[PDB]
Symmetry: C2
């Protein structure tokens, strides 16, 4: 029953933060993979 | 010239992994700037 404006704002910010977190982890995983494989050269 | 195929494969793999990392770094940076801009509305 909260104002649609606030509801939409909170959702959009939450979603952007989640995207950032996901990509942070994806990047960390890719770095770990590259580093592992480099030390197997 | 004296490198085995397996090592050529490993080099190609590392090169591809470094590129995946580079692209994800850019993507993450873009997500971060996006989140910063969105959080201004709070």
């Amino acid at each position: 029953h909260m104002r649609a404006e606030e509801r939409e704002r909170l959702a959009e910010v939450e979603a952007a933060l989640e995207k950032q977190r996901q990509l942070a982890e994806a990047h960390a995983q890719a770095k770990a993979q590259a580093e592992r494989e480099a030390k197997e050269l």
